[PDB]
Design a protein around this ligand. Structure first.
Ligand SMILES: [Zn+2]
Length: 22
């Protein structure tokens, strides 16, 4: 859903930015 809140404000990005948790 292009939910890249954080300081990205976009889509997909966050998953690669704040989506990974390892
Ligand atoms: Zn981010």
């Amino acid at each position: 859903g292009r939910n890249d809140p954080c300081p990205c404000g976009s889509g997909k990005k966050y998953k690669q930015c704040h989506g990974r948790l390892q």
